[PDB]
């Protein structure tokens, strides 16, 4: 029952990359179990980035992430946290390999299209911060016997 938190940032929304991000996870067999588009409040973004609160760029980041709508979502599947990190690519786009989201679409670390949880512990916290238990949908994937051993 592993899950990860993925969020399309304001630049991903502006550039029309929301569907592209979702499709990369769907094609790897991962289950979409929650999604919404929203204007994130300052307090929500400060709690989301709480590990960065002591850093000089924290206020600039929180303001940028509230400057347009975001699309938080949740995917479920085997090794979805670690594979999600690989699929997004390095934080620095010039260090990202081609075929990753940031390697294909991004030029600047400050405009890198999408967030993903960096660990299981972070994923569980971020999922519960952005989504209430009622917003998490549950279903049995038909192709389940052919994606997992």
């Amino acid at each position: 029952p592993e899950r990860t938190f993925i969020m399309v940032k304001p630049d991903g929304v502006q550039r029309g990359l929301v569907g592209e991000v979702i499709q990369r996870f769907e094609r790897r067999g991962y289950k979409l179990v929650a999604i919404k588009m929203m204007h994130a409040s300052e307090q929500l973004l400060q709690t989301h980035y709480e590990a960065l609160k002591s850093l000089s760029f924290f206020p600039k980041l929180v303001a940028y992430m509230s400057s347009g709508p975001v699309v938080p979502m949740v995917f479920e599947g085997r090794k979805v946290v670690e594979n999600g990190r690989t699929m997004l690519g390095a934080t620095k786009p010039e260090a990202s390999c081609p075929g990753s989201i940031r390697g294909d679409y991004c030029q600047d670390v400050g405009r890198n299209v999408v967030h993903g949880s960096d660990s299981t512990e972070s994923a569980n916290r971020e999922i519960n911060l952005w989504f209430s238990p009622q917003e998490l949908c549950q279903y049995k994937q038909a192709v389940d016997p052919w994606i997992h051993e």
Copy 2:
């Protein structure tokens, strides 16, 4: 601004076509302004499909549309209602042209992946049934001067 209601049906979710549906609208420059994943109640489905009650086998439709999660969403832009119909393709996939969603992905009118509003009046009615006003997001598309005159 013109808006239309698009909803991925439970078979579209199962088959991993949510991102595909979204990308077809983003590709055409349309703005995503709301989206969520949910289990639709029978009462919501019966009101949504009020017009089809004069047709045979209404319980089969309600049971199909509540057999898994759905993804309702709202897109904004010029002629988005009529263009949304063309992009989805004919209701019957056999009558749909390749390049449309149903022409590319569907074999059966009863499993046709996605719903879209058939008129401006239906779009306004459906948007208000599925989304509260606070759920619709507002932003200014950077490419606006290049997608319409």
Copy 3:
């Protein structure tokens, strides 16, 4: 269980379009049940194209279809015959809609990349010419409940 006969012609093989033809049927949920690559004999081609002997330049057709390998295959699913015809596009590529195989890839009716059965009667006849019953594979598609009612 409806089935249709699809065959990539020698120009489709040369131009690297075998995977593209197969993927157009797979993404619509159709089941691949047989496939091979072969050099078709003149006797097989004359029987396959029996109905075209009433048209001019029959030796030219047999020679072209013998000028390189072909890839016959069989797909199974609801309305696969009539949808197969639409997916391939009009015989003349200049009458084919964009989104069809011939509309996307072909310039010449004489080099139109792929063959498909025009009827269920023709499909049954063509499947028997090209494949022994022992070559057809049988399996249960996991997504079956989601591609048709």
Copy 4:
């Protein structure tokens, strides 16, 4: 040797669709024989649209077509003029089929991404207006026997 004139308009340049337009023609086996990016003077655009110069929307059209770079190009192959029309789609995007350029990417006739010749006579005029003979390249396509009969 049939040829047509295709030109990406300023909105197609801005939206990063130059490669998409070119690929639509390459995948149908058409030969790129000339291409360049330029800022077209008002005077050059007035000659290209000579037929519209007395109409009320003429100053608006010339200002838009000089508001950014354009990419004129020439493609060669059988039926390239008529097939180019179908591949671009109807002038008004809302009348365009899915799978055409304007059906996939455009919302507004005034921002319809790309121009293409409407006839052999227009193609010859437009090619000779935008390109000198020395800019037209000549080569023998290796797949020629597999695209032509």
Copy 5:
């Protein structure tokens, strides 16, 4: 003759509709398809295919899984097709696979990793001869040959 490699879509690749995708990855790199078929593989054939694994604990589970649905064996031809085939498929474990590889794009689980490919030219020639008779292998001259290799 030219270098060849054996590629086979596994039962999960067939179920998930990925046969055309695998083929197209090789075609777009200029490689020539020279044989292909869909079949139910017997346990006898699969034990010989995986004979180097016969001493390992997971061998019976692997043979049973690989016979639980149809597979699509095929053969591609071209310069360095064995080595490049391995790179295109990606690492055995999908979580170690780079994005852009088949397993990195589509797979979650090493036991459901969609496709097999030969790991050496010796293996490639043994696997081709095991799954295909010489008559099933087709020969043609690729038109773009002068533009894909020097």
Copy 6:
């Protein structure tokens, strides 16, 4: 601004990959600012490859690069030189990652489809060698605030 020189080689033109190369840069937000198709002269190619002029393979490389038309072009954006190298992939295709141009399409170092500048100094020299200043176009990209921080 940062610019890099990219050139589709004669095999990339023959194989219909010109639009694919362009789209790889466009989708990463890089601006196309110059392009043309031409038959490169022996003297032009000798100057382009002047760093290799003492090597054994130099005459054969120069001869091959004039054996068909090429498509030189210029892209502009942040880190476009280093990212261009990554997007093209290793010089030898067998050392190239999947997702790069050479990793996706090439088998042979001598037929590796595309050239790209290896440094800022090389890019400036190559741009001025192949393009006169009147061929370089500039425009204000609308999505600039969403690709650069």
